[PDB]
């Protein structure tokens, strides 16, 4: 995502995720609360039940922030600015959680986009979810 092929594999990718950004963001978060129990902690005020109206709606804002990043690969630092404040300075989210979430996000795309989720696309999508997680924790820099 700091190359030409990625930017191309990223934008090319999300193109296929299209209007499901929300759904997946949601499911990814489910896959994360279920698979990685310790991440529940940052969300007590949320109803982590399946189909919860909260998770669904938060899955949406996540789905969004990602569509914004895909449209600004040139300047992730400036675009995802305020989001960096919120997780690092404010919420003080542990950096490990980000890997776990990018993992659960890729599993989700795997489920809904097998033929589109190539190994070539799988890789750029990893540097991306990584270029992202780093701009959002950089208040520890």
């Amino acid at each position: 995502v700091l190359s030409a092929a990625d930017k191309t594999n990223v934008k090319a990718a999300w193109s296929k995720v299209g209007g499901h950004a929300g759904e997946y963001g949601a499911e990814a978060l489910e896959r994360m609360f279920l698979g990685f129990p310790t991440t529940k902690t940052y969300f007590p005020h949320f109803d982590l039940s399946h189909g919860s109206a909260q998770v669904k709606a938060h899955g949406k804002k996540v789905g969004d922030a990602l569509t914004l990043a895909v449209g600004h690969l040139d300047d992730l630092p400036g675009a995802l600015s305020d989001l960096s404040n919120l997780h690092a300075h404010k919420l003080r989210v542990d950096p490990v959680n980000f890997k776990l979430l990018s993992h659960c996000l890729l599993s989700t795309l795997a489920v809904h986009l097998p033929n589109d989720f190539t190994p070539a696309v799988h890789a750029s999508l990893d540097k991306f979810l990584s270029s992202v997680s780093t701009v959002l924790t950089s208040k520890y820099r």
Partner: protein
């Protein structure tokens, strides 16, 4: 390592549909392409230049298939994990000197390949159980590594 009836039963049921040959290669192939530093321990396989060629590589499919068969061993031995792999730990920490964390990476690539292969059936329920077997396998391999 310490699942539960409804889980162990669910794990095994699915495995029965897992193609050790077809899933191992993809798994092993998606490791070398996403985490390119992993190629350093496979220079005996020839051309791992680009994505297309790694996946079509015979020693990447052949070995992938050994990896997954070894996972099968663990999936049918969730009690003797530190044992079932004791003599595989030594192999990676001594003769090979692989880093313990490369085990957690592989296992995650593996989970995503299942995802891709079973789709909706690989429910956030089941993947949860899966992240624990992987949890344990990647763990039963770095037993001796400190």
């Amino acid at each position: 390592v310490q699942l539960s009836g409804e889980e162990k039963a669910a794990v095994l049921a699915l495995w029965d549909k897992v193609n050790e040959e077809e899933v191992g290669g993809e798994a092993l192939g998606r490791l070398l392409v996403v985490y390119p530093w992993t190629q350093r321990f496979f220079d005996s396989f020839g051309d791992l230049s680009n994505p297309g060629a790694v996946m079509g590589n015979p020693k990447v499919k052949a070995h992938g298939k050994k990896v997954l068969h070894s996972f099968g061993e663990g999936v049918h031995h969730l009690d003797n994990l530190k044992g079932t792999f004791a003599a595989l730990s030594e192999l990676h920490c001594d003769k090979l000197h692989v880093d313990p964390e490369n085990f957690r990476l592989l296992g995650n690539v593996l989970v995503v390949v299942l995802a891709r292969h079973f789709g909706k059936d690989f429910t956030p329920e089941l993947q949860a159980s899966y992240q624990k077997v992987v949890a344990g396998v990647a763990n039963a391999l770095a037993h001796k590594y400190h």
